């Protein structure tokens with residue numbers, strides 16, 4: 142009766158001699174019969190030599206998986222009535238490295254990810270047992286610690302990693318990242334395996350449109366021809382796709398009239414004339430544009446284009462009699478006798494509305510006397526005794542200071558009570 | 562032969578555990594060295610092993626799955642025996658919480674999915690008689706849920722889950738019951754009340770009673786006259802629900818000169834003289850904001866419509882007065898001067914009627930809008946005057962009316 146305890150590395154060569162029962166147990170000298178055995182396909186003893194040998198190669202991972210202890214039993218009988226209990230352990234060697242399901246994974250991370258957020262990653266697997274199994278994961282974060290790593294265990298004592306966002310992300314600062322996750326096992330020959338993580342930084346609508354300048358001032362000549370270009374506004378959004386697709390439109394509080402007068406093309410941003418711009422109607426107008434991106438929760442942006450009109454001499458002067466005497470002027474009417482009161486006007490402004498008026502001949506004896514703003518008195522010029530005329534067809538002329546100028550005329554008749 | 566017994570805990574005092582004599586095949590028993598002198602003893606002359614007191618497996622072996630007591634007795638003629646008896650667990654304990662009520666402070670702003678710690682329970686019993694799981698009683702339409710998670714040992718702990726959003730303004734407090742259940746065929750349970758105070762987050766804007774108002778006031782109204790008392794309400798708590806009034810960013814300065822709004826009441830009152838002729842009606846754009854963080858503004862608009870009073874007498878102005886001396890035989894109707902009358906008021910208050918002092922020989926003849934010609938009335942002779950002090954009178958149609966006069970002198974040559 143004798144126990145024997147062996148222990149042998151895995152991946153032994155087929156036909157490797159494990160032991161010598163006869164010599165190790167101190168039996169005689171002969172016959173070595175096998176009573177029973179855990180694995181007949183793996184271990185056998187030569188009947189006439191007492192040598193215990195491997196029948197095939199032995200992969201401890203295929204036999205005992207992760208078990209810390211891995212044993213094979215064998216019960217032999219020796220020459221002439223002596224029994225031996227052989228038990229041999231198969232030791233683990235670090236002949237396997239941790240392995241990932243791929244060499245590269247790809248993920249979709251929005252730049253809106255809050256710092257601290259954590260993201261799944263594929264775990265690695267080491268079939269080796271004990272100290273030769275999975276030890277930990279480690280990251281190679283190239284972007285000065287933008288990404289971190291969290292390592293957590295599960296019930297069986299195996300670990301899995303997860304990505305951490307240690308500081309915020311910004312697509313518009315870096316669109317893509319690539320960082321390498323490695324898995325390390327224990328054992329004196331440390332086995333490792335790596336995987337590249339290729340992360341797409343998704344766009345979040347975090348940029349407002351921006352007009353080249355908040356305010357503009359544009360001069361246009363009044364009565365400008367339809368379709369005249371007013372201005373091409375340009376707004377830019379640094380986001381992607383629709384988040385960075387600008388749409389222009391008239392603000393809510395631009396008056397209807399202005400909407401009648403101008404047309405803005407929604408995609409170009411071109412403001413062009415749509416109606417006749419009368420200076421006498423309105424000196425200058427305000428066009429309040431707004432631009433918005435076509436993303437969700439869109440960000441509006443306001444701009445202000447002041448159109449300042451230029452007055453052109455497009456109104457001739459008008460003449461209007463407030464009161465006129467009749468046809469009965471006395472021969473001896475003193476110089477300065479009032480004959481009529483008149484107004485002259487010009488809707489234009491500046492030189493275009495600057496008037497100068499005169500009588501057709503005064504050769505007839507009448508003077509025009511300007512008393513008030515746009516108010517003239519036509520009176521008698523001379524005594525009506527030497528150059529006496531039976532009837533007069535007085536005609537007033539008004540002339541503005543335009544380029545070119547404009548003039549209008551208007552007549553009335555008067556008689557003298559001359560020969561009686 | 563050793564003797565191996567196994568007996569439930571909390572046995573009756575003096576319960577017979579075993580019979581040494583029969584089990585070990587011996588003869589009729591002194592105790593040499595036993596594990597527990599107070600728990601088990603053997604009757605000297607019968608060989609019977611009995612309990613001396615109760616056995617609480619929890620007090621002896623705590624959570625240990627196996628719980629054993631040794632005992633060494635002998636019998637006549639050097640008959641040595643090894644007795645060993647295991648104590649089985651029974652579910653004589655329920656899970657227990659450190660209290661019967663917890664209270665929590667959860668803000669209504671808590672994101673759905675958020676989870677909150679809760680106190681765990683403890684069962685002293687062993688194995689299947691220990692803590693099994695927790696269960697919640699959420700009475701308010703499944704407002705809150707429960708997550709149960711294991712620890713390194715295999716012990717479980719609960720935490721509250723917010724499965725959908727909360728709203729203080731809809732329900733200020735909640736109370737829900739968390740119970741812990743153990744295994745064992747008599748299933749033991751123990752409960753704890755969670756009293757959760759729902760904190761306010763500034764999630765309500767102020768609200769004016771109406772977006773727009775229209776108020777009439779008489780021009781030149783006396784200082785301090787009340788224009789309107791605005792009222793805005795915020796349904797939030799504390800500063801989050803504290804209304805503050807102010808004039809909007811885009812109301813012209815002049816209006817700011819004309820009106821005063823009290824920041825806390827919301828009372829808009831007159832601060833300057835309201836001249837109708839300056840501006841017929843004005844717009845006062847008020848805003849109310851709560852005193853919480855990221856405050857929510859709200860806009861209201863009060864249009865002040867003025868009423869015109871006859872506060873402008875009529876003004877007279879000579880456009881032309883010719884010379885200071887007319888012709889002796891000037892025909893009736895000779896123009897002597899052109900004059901204009903005006904009144905800054907509107908309506909009847911600005912409706913004028915004018916006349917000359919006499920008919921002296923001068924008429925007033927209105928030719929155009931607010932334009933009159935003073936002419937000679939009749940033929941100039943048979944009179945004791947050389948120069949005339951002509952005086953014009955204008956009279957408006959106010960209540961009461963107003964009148965102004967203005968004179969000029971002319972001579973006869």
Ligand SMILES: *[C@@H]1O[C@H](CO[C@@H]2O[C@@H](C)[C@@H](O)[C@@H](O)[C@@H]2O)[C@@H](O[C@@H]2O[C@H](CO)[C@@H](O[C@@H]3O[C@H](CO[C@H]4O[C@H](CO)[C@@H](O)[C@H](O)[C@@H]4O)[C@@H](O)[C@H](O)[C@@H]3O)[C@H](O)[C@H]2NC(C)=O)[C@H](O)[C@H]1NC(C)=O
Nearest residue numbers: 352353354357359370371372373374375376377409410411
């Ligand atoms: C909005 O963005 C446009 C385009 O973006 C530019 O692209 C190039 C130039 C880059 O280098 C950047 O600098 C810019 O962002 C800016 O440029 C306008 O482009 C339009 C589109 O082509 C131009 O319109 C052209 O006008 C030509 C006629 O030129 C006239 O002006 C000269 C100067 O005196 C004058 O001598 C001539 O006789 C004409 O009167 C015409 O031949 C062509 O077909 C086309 O119509 C436009 O001219 C450019 N800007 C301006 C102000 O003219 C814009 O700068 C930007 N908007 C604004 C308001 O700045």
Ligand SMILES: *[C@@H]1O[C@H](CO[C@@H]2O[C@@H](C)[C@@H](O)[C@@H](O)[C@@H]2O)[C@@H](O[C@@H]2O[C@H](CO)[C@@H](O)[C@H](O)[C@H]2NC(C)=O)[C@H](O)[C@H]1NC(C)=O
Nearest residue numbers: 769770771773774775788789790791792793826827828863
């Ligand atoms: C803003 O509120 C004031 C006063 O508030 C009132 O408070 C209570 C006394 C009760 O009357 C509540 O209904 C009110 O909110 C208003 O001033 C009063 O208005 C009521 C009209 O129902 C009138 O009978 C009173 O004479 C007013 N003055 C008082 C009570 O001193 C005011 O009208 C409110 N503003 C607006 C725009 O509605």
Ligand SMILES: *[C@@H]1O[C@H](CO[C@@H]2O[C@@H](C)[C@@H](O)[C@@H](O)[C@@H]2O)[C@@H](O[C@@H]2O[C@H](CO)[C@@H](O)[C@H](O)[C@H]2NC(C)=O)[C@H](O)[C@H]1NC(C)=O
Nearest residue numbers: 918919949950951952953954964965966967968969970971
């Ligand atoms: C021209 O006459 C007016 C009016 O004076 C008199 O008014 C009545 C009493 C009547 O008797 C008329 O015949 C008179 O002409 C003078 O203007 C006002 O005169 C009063 C004194 O009577 C004086 O208190 C006022 O201040 C004067 N002005 C006004 C606006 O009332 C005026 O002075 C006379 N002379 C000239 C050059 O105009």
Ligand SMILES: *[C@@H]1O[C@H](CO)[C@@H](O[C@@H]2O[C@H](CO)[C@@H](O)[C@H](O)[C@H]2NC(C)=O)[C@H](O)[C@H]1NC(C)=O
Nearest residue numbers: 873874875954955956957961962963964965966
């Ligand atoms: C308008 O005319 C009336 C009279 O025609 C003037 O009335 C007088 O006003 C004084 C005060 O200035 C009173 O003391 C008198 O009793 C009034 N007299 C009469 C007869 O009513 C009044 O002054 C004129 N208005 C202006 C601005 O001159």
Ligand SMILES: *[C@@H]1O[C@H](CO)[C@@H](O)[C@H](O)[C@H]1NC(C)=O
Nearest residue numbers: 501534535536550552553554
């Ligand atoms: C008066 O003169 C104007 C301008 O020459 C002329 O048009 C008009 O016919 C004349 N009047 C008469 C009655 O001929």
Ligand SMILES: *[C@@H]1O[C@H](CO)[C@@H](O)[C@H](O)[C@H]1NC(C)=O
Nearest residue numbers: 538539540546547548549550
């Ligand atoms: C005035 O207008 C008339 C229009 O018939 C024109 O013939 C004349 O040349 C003009 N005169 C001046 C000075 O502009």
Ligand SMILES: *[C@H]1O[C@H](CO)[C@@H](O)[C@H](O)[C@@H]1O
Nearest residue numbers: 323324331332333334335
């Ligand atoms: C892990 O580390 C080893 C070095 O021990 C490398 O050989 C391997 O490629 C992996 O990077």
Ligand SMILES: *[C@H]1O[C@H](CO)[C@@H](O)[C@H](O)[C@@H]1O
Nearest residue numbers: 244245321334335336337
């Ligand atoms: C980690 O490193 C290995 C080198 O052994 C690569 O093959 C792998 O793609 C990852 O970069």
Ligand SMILES: *[C@H]1O[C@H](CO)[C@@H](O)[C@H](O)[C@@H]1O
Nearest residue numbers: 740742748749750751752
């Ligand atoms: C836990 O469950 C028991 C029944 O198993 C109840 O009786 C007890 O009140 C508690 O709710």
Ligand SMILES: *[C@H]1O[C@H](CO)[C@@H](O)[C@H](O)[C@@H]1O
Nearest residue numbers: 661662738751752753754
């Ligand atoms: C659970 O039951 C206990 C009583 O045992 C209470 O503390 C609680 O109110 C809940 O009903």
Ligand SMILES: [Ca+2]
Nearest residue numbers: 200201202236
């Ligand atoms: Ca192997």
Ligand SMILES: [Ca+2]
Nearest residue numbers: 237269273326
């Ligand atoms: Ca390994």
Ligand SMILES: [Ca+2]
Nearest residue numbers: 234235236269
């Ligand atoms: Ca191995």
Ligand SMILES: [Ca+2]
Nearest residue numbers: 311312313347
């Ligand atoms: Ca960004």
Ligand SMILES: [Ca+2]
Nearest residue numbers: 345346347380
């Ligand atoms: Ca972005």
Ligand SMILES: [Ca+2]
Nearest residue numbers: 348380384434
């Ligand atoms: Ca954008």
